[PDB]
Tab-separated table of C-alpha atoms in Angstrom:
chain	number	residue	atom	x	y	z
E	5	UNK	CA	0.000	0.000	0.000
E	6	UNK	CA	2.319	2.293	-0.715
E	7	UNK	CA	-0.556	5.197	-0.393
E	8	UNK	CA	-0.874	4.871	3.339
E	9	UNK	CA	-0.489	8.347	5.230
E	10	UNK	CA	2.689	6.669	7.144
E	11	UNK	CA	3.807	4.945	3.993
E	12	UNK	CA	3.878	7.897	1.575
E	13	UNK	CA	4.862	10.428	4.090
E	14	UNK	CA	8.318	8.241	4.318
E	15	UNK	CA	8.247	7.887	0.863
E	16	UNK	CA	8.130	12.074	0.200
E	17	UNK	CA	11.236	12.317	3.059
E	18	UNK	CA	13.251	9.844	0.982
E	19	UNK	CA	12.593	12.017	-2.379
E	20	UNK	CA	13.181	14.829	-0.616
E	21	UNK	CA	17.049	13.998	0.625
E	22	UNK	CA	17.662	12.862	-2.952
E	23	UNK	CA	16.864	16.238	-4.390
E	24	UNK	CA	15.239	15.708	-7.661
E	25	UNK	CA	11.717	16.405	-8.551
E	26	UNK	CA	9.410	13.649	-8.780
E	27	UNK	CA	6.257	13.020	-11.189
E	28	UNK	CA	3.692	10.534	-10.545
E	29	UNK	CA	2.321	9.558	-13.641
E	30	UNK	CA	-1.099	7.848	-13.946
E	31	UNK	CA	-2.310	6.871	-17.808
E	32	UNK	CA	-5.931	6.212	-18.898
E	33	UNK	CA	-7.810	3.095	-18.594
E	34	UNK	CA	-5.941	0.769	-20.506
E	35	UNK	CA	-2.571	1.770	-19.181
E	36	UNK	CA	0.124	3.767	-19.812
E	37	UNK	CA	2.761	3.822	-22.883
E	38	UNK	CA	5.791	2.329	-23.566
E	39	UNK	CA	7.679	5.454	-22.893
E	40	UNK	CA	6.222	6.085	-19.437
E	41	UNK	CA	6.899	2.602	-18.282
E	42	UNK	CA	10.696	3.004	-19.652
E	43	UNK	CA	10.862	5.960	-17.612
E	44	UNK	CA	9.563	4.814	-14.199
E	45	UNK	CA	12.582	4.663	-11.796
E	46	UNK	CA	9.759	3.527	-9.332
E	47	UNK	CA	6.150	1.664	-10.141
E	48	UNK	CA	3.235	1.296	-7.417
E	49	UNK	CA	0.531	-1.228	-8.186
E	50	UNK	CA	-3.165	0.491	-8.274
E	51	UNK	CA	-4.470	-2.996	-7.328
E	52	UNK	CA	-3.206	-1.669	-4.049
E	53	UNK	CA	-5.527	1.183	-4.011
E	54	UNK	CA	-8.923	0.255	-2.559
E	55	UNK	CA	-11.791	2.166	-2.244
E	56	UNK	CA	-12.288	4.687	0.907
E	57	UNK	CA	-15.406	3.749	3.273
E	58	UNK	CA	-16.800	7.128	2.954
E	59	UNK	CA	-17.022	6.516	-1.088
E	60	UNK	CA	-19.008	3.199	-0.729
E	61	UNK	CA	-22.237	5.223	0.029
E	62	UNK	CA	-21.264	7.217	-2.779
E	63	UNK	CA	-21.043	4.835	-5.034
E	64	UNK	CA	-23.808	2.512	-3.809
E	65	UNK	CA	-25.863	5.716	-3.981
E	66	UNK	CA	-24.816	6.260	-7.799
E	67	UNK	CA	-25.183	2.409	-8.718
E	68	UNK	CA	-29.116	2.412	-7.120
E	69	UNK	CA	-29.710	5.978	-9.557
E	70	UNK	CA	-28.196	3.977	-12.471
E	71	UNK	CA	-30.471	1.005	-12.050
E	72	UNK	CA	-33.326	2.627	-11.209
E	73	UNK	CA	-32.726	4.445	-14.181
E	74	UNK	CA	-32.915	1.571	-16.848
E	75	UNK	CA	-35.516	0.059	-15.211
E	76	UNK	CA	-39.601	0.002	-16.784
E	77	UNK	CA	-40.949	1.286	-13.540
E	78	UNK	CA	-43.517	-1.342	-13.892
E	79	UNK	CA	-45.987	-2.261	-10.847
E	80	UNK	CA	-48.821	-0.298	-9.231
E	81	UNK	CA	-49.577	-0.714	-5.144
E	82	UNK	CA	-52.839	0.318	-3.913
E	83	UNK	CA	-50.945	1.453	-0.730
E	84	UNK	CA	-48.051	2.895	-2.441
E	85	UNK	CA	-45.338	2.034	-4.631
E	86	UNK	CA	-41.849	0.720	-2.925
E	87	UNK	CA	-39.695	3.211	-1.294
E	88	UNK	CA	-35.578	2.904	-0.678
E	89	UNK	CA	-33.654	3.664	2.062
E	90	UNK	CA	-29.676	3.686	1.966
E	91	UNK	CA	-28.912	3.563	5.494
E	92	UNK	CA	-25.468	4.267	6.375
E	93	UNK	CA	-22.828	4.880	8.864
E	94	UNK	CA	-21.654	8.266	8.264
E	95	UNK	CA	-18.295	7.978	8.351
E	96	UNK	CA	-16.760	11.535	7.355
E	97	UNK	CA	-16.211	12.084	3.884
E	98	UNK	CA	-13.305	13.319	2.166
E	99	UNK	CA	-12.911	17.583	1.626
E	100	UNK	CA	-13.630	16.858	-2.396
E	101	UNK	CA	-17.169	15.228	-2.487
E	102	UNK	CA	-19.187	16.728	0.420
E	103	UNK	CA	-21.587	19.800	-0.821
E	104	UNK	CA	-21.251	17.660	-4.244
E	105	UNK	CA	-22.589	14.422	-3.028
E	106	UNK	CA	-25.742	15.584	-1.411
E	107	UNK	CA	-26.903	18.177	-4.481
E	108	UNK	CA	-26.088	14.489	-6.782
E	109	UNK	CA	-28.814	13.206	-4.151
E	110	UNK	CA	-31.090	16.629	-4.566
E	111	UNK	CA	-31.139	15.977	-8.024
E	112	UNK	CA	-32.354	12.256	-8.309
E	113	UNK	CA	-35.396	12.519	-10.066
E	114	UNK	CA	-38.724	13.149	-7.755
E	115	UNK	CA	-40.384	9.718	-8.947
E	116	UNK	CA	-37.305	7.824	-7.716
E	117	UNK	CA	-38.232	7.119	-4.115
E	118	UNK	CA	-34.970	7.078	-2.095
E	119	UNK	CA	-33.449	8.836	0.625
E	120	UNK	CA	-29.911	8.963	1.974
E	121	UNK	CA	-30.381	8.427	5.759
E	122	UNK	CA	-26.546	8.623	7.721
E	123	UNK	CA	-26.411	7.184	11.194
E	124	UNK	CA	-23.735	8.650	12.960
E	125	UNK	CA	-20.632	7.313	13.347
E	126	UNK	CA	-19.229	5.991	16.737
E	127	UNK	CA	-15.518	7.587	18.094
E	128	UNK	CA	-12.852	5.554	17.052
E	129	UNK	CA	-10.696	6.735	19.723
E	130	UNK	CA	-8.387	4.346	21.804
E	131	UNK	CA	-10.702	4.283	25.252
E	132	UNK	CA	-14.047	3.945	23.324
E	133	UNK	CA	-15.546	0.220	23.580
E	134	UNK	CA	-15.444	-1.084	19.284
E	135	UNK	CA	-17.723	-4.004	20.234
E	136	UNK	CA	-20.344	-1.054	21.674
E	137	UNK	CA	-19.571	0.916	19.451
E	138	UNK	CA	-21.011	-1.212	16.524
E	139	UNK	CA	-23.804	-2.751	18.646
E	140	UNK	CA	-25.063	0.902	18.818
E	141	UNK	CA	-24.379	1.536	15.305
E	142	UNK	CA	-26.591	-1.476	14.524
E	143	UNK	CA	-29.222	-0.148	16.893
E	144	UNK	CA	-29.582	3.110	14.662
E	145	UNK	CA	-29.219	1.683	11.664
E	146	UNK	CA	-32.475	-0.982	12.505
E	147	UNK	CA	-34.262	1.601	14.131
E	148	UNK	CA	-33.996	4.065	10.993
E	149	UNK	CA	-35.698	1.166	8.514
E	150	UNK	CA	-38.047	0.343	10.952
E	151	UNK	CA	-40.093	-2.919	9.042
E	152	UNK	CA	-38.456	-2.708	5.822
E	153	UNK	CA	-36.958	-5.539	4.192
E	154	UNK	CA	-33.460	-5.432	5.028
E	155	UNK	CA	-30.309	-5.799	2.571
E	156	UNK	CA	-26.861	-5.499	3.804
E	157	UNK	CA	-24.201	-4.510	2.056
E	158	UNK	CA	-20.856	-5.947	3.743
I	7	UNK	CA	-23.010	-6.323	-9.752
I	8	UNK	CA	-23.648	-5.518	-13.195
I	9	UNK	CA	-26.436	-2.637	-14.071
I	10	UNK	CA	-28.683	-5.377	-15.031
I	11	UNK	CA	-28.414	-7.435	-12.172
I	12	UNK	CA	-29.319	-4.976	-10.101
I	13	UNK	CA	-32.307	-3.056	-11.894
I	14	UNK	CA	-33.679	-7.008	-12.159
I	15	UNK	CA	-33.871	-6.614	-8.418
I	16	UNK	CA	-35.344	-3.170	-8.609
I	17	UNK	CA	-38.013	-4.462	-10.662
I	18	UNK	CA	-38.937	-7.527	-8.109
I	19	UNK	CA	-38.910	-5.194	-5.206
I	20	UNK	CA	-41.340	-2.926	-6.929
I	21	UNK	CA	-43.391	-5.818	-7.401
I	22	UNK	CA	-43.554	-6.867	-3.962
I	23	UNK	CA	-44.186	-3.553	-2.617
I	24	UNK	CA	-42.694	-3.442	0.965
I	25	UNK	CA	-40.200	-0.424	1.308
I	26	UNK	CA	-36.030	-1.522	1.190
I	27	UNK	CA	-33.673	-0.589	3.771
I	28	UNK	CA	-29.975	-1.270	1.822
I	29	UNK	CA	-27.590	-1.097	4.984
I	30	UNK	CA	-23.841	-0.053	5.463
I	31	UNK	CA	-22.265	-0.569	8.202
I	32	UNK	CA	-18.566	1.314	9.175
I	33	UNK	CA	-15.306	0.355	8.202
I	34	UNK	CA	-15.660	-2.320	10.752
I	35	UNK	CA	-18.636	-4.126	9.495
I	36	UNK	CA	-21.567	-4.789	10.431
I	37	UNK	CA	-22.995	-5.901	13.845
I	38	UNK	CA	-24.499	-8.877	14.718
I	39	UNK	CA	-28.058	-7.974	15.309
I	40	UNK	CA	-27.653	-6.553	11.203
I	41	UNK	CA	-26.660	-9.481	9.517
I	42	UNK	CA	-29.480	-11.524	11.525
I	43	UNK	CA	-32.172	-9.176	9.953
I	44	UNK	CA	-30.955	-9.219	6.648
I	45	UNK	CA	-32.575	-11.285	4.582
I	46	UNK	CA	-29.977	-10.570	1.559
I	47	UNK	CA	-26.297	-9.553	1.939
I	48	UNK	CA	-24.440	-8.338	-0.735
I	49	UNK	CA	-20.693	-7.736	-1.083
I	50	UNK	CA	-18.996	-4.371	-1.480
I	51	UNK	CA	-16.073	-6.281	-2.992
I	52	UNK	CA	-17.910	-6.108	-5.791
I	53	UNK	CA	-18.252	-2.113	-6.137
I	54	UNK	CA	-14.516	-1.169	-7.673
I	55	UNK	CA	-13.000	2.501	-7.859
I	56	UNK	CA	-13.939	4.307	-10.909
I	57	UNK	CA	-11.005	5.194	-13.303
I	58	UNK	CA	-11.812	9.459	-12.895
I	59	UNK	CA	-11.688	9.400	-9.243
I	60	UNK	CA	-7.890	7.630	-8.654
I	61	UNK	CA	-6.278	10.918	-9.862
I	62	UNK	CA	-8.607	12.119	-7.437
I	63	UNK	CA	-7.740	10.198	-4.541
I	64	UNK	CA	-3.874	9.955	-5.112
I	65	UNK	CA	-4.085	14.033	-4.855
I	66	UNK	CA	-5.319	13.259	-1.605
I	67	UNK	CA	-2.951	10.936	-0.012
I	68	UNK	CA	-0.213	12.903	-1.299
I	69	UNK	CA	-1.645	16.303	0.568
I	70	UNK	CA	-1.982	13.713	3.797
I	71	UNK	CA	1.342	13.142	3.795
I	72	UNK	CA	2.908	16.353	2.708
I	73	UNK	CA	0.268	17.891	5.486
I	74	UNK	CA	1.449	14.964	8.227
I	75	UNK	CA	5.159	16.165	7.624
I	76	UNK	CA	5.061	19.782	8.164
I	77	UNK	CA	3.619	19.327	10.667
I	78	UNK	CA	6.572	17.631	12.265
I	79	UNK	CA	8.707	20.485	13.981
I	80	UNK	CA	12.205	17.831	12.456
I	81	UNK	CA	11.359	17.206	9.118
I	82	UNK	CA	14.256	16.745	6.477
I	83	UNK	CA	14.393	19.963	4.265
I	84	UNK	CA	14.693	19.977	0.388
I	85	UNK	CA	13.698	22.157	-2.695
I	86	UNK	CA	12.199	18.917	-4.616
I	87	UNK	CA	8.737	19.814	-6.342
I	88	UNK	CA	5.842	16.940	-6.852
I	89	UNK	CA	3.961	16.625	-9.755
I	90	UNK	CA	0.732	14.581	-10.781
I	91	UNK	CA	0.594	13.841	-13.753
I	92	UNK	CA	-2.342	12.302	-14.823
I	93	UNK	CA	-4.808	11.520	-18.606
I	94	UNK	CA	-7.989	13.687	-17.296
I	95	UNK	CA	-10.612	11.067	-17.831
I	96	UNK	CA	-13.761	12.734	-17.336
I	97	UNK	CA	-15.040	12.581	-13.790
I	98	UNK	CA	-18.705	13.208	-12.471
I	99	UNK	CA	-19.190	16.876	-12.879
I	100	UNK	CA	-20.235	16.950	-8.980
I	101	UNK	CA	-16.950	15.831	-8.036
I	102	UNK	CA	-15.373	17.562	-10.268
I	103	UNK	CA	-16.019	20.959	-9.382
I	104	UNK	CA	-15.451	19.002	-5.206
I	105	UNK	CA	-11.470	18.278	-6.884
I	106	UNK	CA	-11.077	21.812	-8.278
I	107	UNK	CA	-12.073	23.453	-4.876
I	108	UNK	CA	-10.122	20.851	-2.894
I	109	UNK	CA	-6.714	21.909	-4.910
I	110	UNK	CA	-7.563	25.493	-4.913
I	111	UNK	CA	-7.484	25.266	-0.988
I	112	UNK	CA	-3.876	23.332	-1.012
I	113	UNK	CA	-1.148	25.622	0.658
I	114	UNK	CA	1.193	27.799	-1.568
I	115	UNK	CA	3.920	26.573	0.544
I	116	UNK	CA	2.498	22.559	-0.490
I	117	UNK	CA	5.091	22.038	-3.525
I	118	UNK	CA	2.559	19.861	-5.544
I	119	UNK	CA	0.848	20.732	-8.890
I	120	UNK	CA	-1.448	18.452	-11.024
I	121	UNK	CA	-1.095	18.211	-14.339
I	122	UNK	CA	-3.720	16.979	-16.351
I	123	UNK	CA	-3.149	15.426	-19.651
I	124	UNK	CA	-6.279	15.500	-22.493
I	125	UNK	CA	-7.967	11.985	-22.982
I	126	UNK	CA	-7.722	10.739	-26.027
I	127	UNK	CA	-11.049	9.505	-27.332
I	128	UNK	CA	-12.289	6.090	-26.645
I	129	UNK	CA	-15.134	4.347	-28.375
I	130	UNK	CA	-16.150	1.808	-30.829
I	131	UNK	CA	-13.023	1.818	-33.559
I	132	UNK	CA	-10.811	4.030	-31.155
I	133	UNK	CA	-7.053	2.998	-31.932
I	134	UNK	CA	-5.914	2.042	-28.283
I	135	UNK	CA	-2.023	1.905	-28.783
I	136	UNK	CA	-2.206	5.211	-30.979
I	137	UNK	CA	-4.097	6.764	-27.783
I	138	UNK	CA	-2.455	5.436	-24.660
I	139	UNK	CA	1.193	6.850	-27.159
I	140	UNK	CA	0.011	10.320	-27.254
I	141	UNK	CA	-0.918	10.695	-23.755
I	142	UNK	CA	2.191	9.320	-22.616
I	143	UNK	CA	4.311	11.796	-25.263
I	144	UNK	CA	2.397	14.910	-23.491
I	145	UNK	CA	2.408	12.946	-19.939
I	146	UNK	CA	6.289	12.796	-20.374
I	147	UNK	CA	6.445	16.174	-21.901
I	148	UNK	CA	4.934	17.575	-18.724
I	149	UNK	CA	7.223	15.863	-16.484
I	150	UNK	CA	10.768	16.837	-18.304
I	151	UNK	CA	13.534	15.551	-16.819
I	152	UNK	CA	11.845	14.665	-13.267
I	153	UNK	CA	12.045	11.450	-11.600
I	154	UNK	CA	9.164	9.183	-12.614
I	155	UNK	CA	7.013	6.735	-10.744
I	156	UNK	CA	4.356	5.332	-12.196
I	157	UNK	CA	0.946	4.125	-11.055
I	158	UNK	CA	-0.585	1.598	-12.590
């Protein structure tokens, strides 16, 4: 992982007693070229980079729109029509998506039923219980879907 | 799981009627008491990091670090400069406009710029080894004479 706050801070220091300037280079899709991979005097793997917990409701959020999307919006319920609920622990999100994410959800068209509901997160500090901590989780999370079928995502 | 897969699902739970609760637990997991209710359980192994966004969070970890170090009050010194250079596949526009904000607030003092390189364009007939040739002449055009690591 060589993208670990510890890891790459080291990593910076030893570039920095060299001297030289350094560029990361990241291609498209498919790869880089020849010529970059000739000139990398170091390589990191990106099967080492894994996604950030904060982005899974992001992208669970985006792959529900996307479905919904393509789908024939078929049945009719007397009662009413099936609603979603993501419920999530809301772990804090990175600087770059906040005030972004939530006008993505604001704009999810008014026929797709679906809200965003975040339970907070427990403190993940070192005199704070972790087995607690994700019993109470749990205890939100239930509470906020009530008697609707539950999926888990895990 | 694929597009399909999942709107198929939709479509049965629309049909049923009874409101869905999808539930994510914290980096931990879920608790017990969860996984007993659930009466499906789907892995997030299967959700991977879209293309747009590693340029994204590599500018991240490398403002962690630089911010973790100079912070440090015995840090080693040096003039070295970091670049990212990176093919500027085209992101969400909501996230977008998130990245451009998050740079503008880095630090002067944070010796870091990003680069990005034009796409070349993909599609049905798109010439792949033409494409990934030309981003890496301007990708190595940007860089100079700079060490290189690559990420891939």
């Amino acid at each position: 992982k060589p993208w670990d706050t510890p890891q790459l801070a080291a990593e910076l220091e030893r570039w920095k007693l060299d001297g030289r300037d350094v560029s990361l280079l990241i291609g498209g899709p498919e790869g880089l070229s020849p010529a970059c991979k000739a000139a990398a005097e170091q390589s990191w793997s990106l099967s080492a980079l894994t996604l950030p917990h904060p982005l899974v409701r992001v992208l669970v959020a985006e792959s529900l729109y996307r479905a919904w999307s393509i789908t024939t919006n078929h049945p009719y319920h007397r009662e009413g029509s099936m609603k979603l609920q993501l419920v999530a622990v809301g772990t804090k999100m990175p600087d770059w998506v906040q005030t972004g994410f939530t006008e993505y959800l604001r704009r999810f068209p008014k026929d797709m039923p679906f809200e965003l509901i975040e339970i907070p997160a427990g403190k993940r500090g070192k005199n704070a219980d972790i087995k607690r901590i994700l019993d109470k989780e749990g205890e939100q999370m239930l509470a906020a879907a009530g008697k609707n079928r539950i999926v888990t995502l895990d």
